[PDB]
């Protein structure tokens, strides 16, 4: 159940200048 890796990149996609 590999949920923690989908931590992994949307950990970049909140400061992905999405704002």
């Known amino acids: ?3 923690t ?3 992994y990149y ?3 996609m909140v ?3 999405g704002y």
């Open 1 to 3: 159940q590999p949920f």
């Open 5 to 7: 890796k989908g931590a």
């Open 10 to 12: 949307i950990g970049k």
């Open 15 to 17: 400061w992905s200048k």
